[PDB]
Amino acid sequence: MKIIALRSSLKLAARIAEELKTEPVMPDERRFPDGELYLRYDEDLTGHNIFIIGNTHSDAEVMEMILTLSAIQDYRTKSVNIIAPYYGYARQHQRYKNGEPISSQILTEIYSSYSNSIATVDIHDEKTLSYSKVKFSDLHANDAIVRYYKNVDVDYVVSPDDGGLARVADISAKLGKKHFFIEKKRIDDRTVEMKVPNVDVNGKKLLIVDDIISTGGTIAKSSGLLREKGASKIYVSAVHGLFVNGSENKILQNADEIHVTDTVESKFSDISVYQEVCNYIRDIDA
Amino acid sequence: MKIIALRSSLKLAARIAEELKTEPVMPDERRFPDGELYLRYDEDLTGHNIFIIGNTHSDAEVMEMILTLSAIQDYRTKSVNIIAPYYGYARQHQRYKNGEPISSQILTEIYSSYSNSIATVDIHDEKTLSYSKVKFSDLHANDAIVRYYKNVDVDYVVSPDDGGLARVADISAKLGKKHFFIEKKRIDDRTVEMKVPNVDVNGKKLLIVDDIISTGGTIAKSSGLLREKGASKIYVSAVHGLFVNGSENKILQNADEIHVTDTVESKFSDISVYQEVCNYIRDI
Ligand SMILES: Nc1ncnc2c1ncn2[C@@H]1O[C@H](COP(=O)(O)OP(=O)(O)O)[C@@H](O)[C@H]1O
Ligand SMILES: Nc1ncnc2c1ncn2[C@@H]1O[C@H](COP(=O)(O)OP(=O)(O)O)[C@@H](O)[C@H]1O
């Protein structure tokens, strides 16, 4: 096997490569004066099962992925397998207005046409898996989150909305804890919140879990409400910590700690998903 | 027909639309807070021949093109036709070292998969045309350049190197002028230059023409060679004016004027290729 480590995923790809006792192959990469991207993989990849690890969210990450998929065609590889720990554009998985792109469809079609398999960790809406011609696997960070929190005092696991329930149910069960979710709706400029079930959180330690933290509004709001109701500790976790526009600071106004995975690397990346990705890679072989 | 005008090509696209008496359809476009691109074309495109006009050079231009190609699939269109006035990645049209991408190959494959035709103005190396499943046409700015210079005093048309020859030969023929090219090579850190044929440029007015101006090094060096041999006026033209940081200054050190087309819009875009693109569209 050969593991290719793209710029966005150096940390996670390195952990994965180290665990599988192999080189994290990085490209030589630069921008030409006109801004066009240059990449080169001088290692001989012929006859190997290739695993390309890189996120697909920023314009530059997309270019890095596409050009890599061209660069590796210089070699007679056994297979080409994309692993995008965070899969960009998964939120645009249908048309919400006439004349909108299904961004996740066209991008997934492109990736599929140049690979033998695709995988990601905790995609937003599994609909997008169906846009791929090749097998598109949705890996889960559940076990990594459990391994971190088994050593934290937690009373309830909480979903900040009435989605992401399956995840919270699984994590809570593996932790041996109960769980609940928060339903937040706006009704004529006034916000109404309900806990389901209506758990008394006074003096309780709560673990809030979501797939993505981007702007952090919902989590920040729910955290404040919970603190207001007497929660003694609030831990916030998410798989993908994008942290746009001061969201970590908004959340930390009322939550005690934030812990995310290394799918998107930041100072809050304390939970590694390297094992889950390694199990997947071993399955595909090489 | 419907003309879609992307961000990078609003000026040229508007000129084309006006000439064809149609709307330059622009998207609503914004970035989400996380940086992802959003586009929307709310106009009904059903049953029309669509012409998407946008460059494909920057990361953002590539995303705008790709997402547009998805957005328009919301409509049962008669045909989808891409016109990229400046076609990005045309300089990476083969592998130059092992493990490099053939960037223009995979990008052209992607575009070809989602359209019925592609066209561009003065691609760098026609090899890239062969990477398309659909007909990929190479349009030329020659006539527009000739039209502009018909009213300028020119003695010779000049190529900065031995590759832009066909263009310079055509342009000069259409202007009724002689032409030459400059061969520049480095031999042990020192520069040697040869004019072919070995024209006397002392007191002569010269029009230098190239396809692309990026850093301007090439054009600036040639302009300098010619000025020092006594050229009285030097006009610099190119189809695609990218003008990376220091370029404009470097060129105007020895050249008098710069005039490029509107394939890439800048302060120096004095020559429009709208008529050449309108011809293509009228015939497609
Ligand atoms: N990167 C992004 N950031 C924020 N919003 C996005 C992004 N991509 C798409 N969207 C928008 O998010 C909305 C859909 O989100 P959501 O309300 O969860 O609907 P769904 O339940 O179908 O996912 C759509 O209006 C879509 O255009
Ligand atoms: N956007 C770009 N800007 C500058 N150089 C590039 C760009 N894209 C590719 N190149 C490089 O330009 C070189 C090819 O130029 P050149 O030596 O004239 O050969 P060719 O005749 O094939 O153009 C290659 O090394 C290629 O990697």
Q: Which helix (H) or strand (E) holds B62?
A: helix B59-71
Interface residue of B38, B70, B96, B214 to substitute, partner A, most A CBs within 10 Å: B70
Cβ atoms of B93 and B108 within 8 Å: the answer is no
| CA neighbor of A239 nearest in space, from A12, A16, A22 | A12
Residues 39-58 of B with CB under 8 A from A: 39-43, 45, 57-58
What domains lie within chain B, and their CATH numbers?
1-140+273-284 (3.40.50.2020), 141-272 (3.40.50.2020)
Two tokens at B168? 């310079």
A contacts of B70 (beta carbons < 8 Å) = 101-103, 105-106
Q: Which residues line ligand 1 (CB under 6 A)?
A: A 91-92, 96, 125; B 32, 34, 36
CB contact under 8 A, B106 and A69: yes
Three-point CA angle B63, A65, A268, nearest 5°: 95
What's the gap in Å between A65 CA and the centre of ligand 2?
Answer: 21
CB contact under 8 A, B59 and A63: yes
Q: How far apart are CA B13 and CA A105, in angstroms?
A: 28
Q: How far apart are CA B135 and CA A164, in angstroms?
A: 47
**What is the DSSP annotation of A7-57?**
GGGHHHHHHHHHHTT--EEPPEEEE-TTS-EEEE--S--TTSEEEEE----
Cβ atoms of B119 and B151 within 8 Å: the answer is no
Q: Tell me which DSSP letter residue B243 carries.
A: -
Two tokens at B190? 């020192």
- Binding-site residue numbers of A for ATP are 34-36, 91-93
CB contact under 8 A, B36 and A91: yes
Find the helix packing angle between B142-149 and B165-175, rounded to 10°: 40
Question: What sections of A72-216 are H helices per DSSP?
Answer: 103-113, 142-149, 165-175
CB crowding A13-30: b at 16 or more within 10 Å, else e: bbbbbeebebebbbbeee
Q: How many CB contacts within 8 angstroms connect chain A with chain B?
A: 129
CB contact under 8 A, A92 and B40: no
- Binding-site residue numbers of B are 34-36, 91-93, 124, 161, 186, 210, 214-218
Which ligand places an atom closest to the C-alpha of B36?
1
User: What residue type is assigned to position B116 of the chain?
Assistant: N
Cβ atoms within 10 Å of A76's Cβ, excluding its own = 9
Q: How far apart are CA B161 and CA B168, in angstroms?
A: 11
CA gyration radius, chain A: 20
Q: What is the position in ligand 1's atom list of the atom closest to the CA of B35? A: 1
What's the gap in Å between A90 CA and the centre of ligand 1?
Answer: 9
What's the gap in Å between B94 CA and the centre of ligand 2?
Answer: 9
> φ, ψ for residue B206 (rounded to 5)?
-120, 135
Report which protein residue has its CA nearest ligand 2's atom 25: B96
A contacts of B98 (beta carbons < 8 Å) = 40, 42, 74
Q: How far apart are CA A242 and CA B61, in angstroms?
A: 23
User: What residue type is assigned to position A4 of the chain?
Assistant: I
SS3 content of chain A, % helix, strand, coil (to 5): 35, 30, 40
| CA neighbor of B170 nearest in space, from B162, B183, B179 | B179
Bin B106: left if φ > 0, else alpha if -120 < ψ < 50, else beta. Answer: alpha
Classified as helix, coil or strand, B112 is helix
Two tokens at B262? 């509107």
Resolution in A: 1.5
Shortest CB distance from A89 goes to which of B36, B68, B92?
B36
To which residue do tokens 């997402």 refer?
A: B67
- Half-sphere CA count of B44, side-chain side, radius 13 A: 2
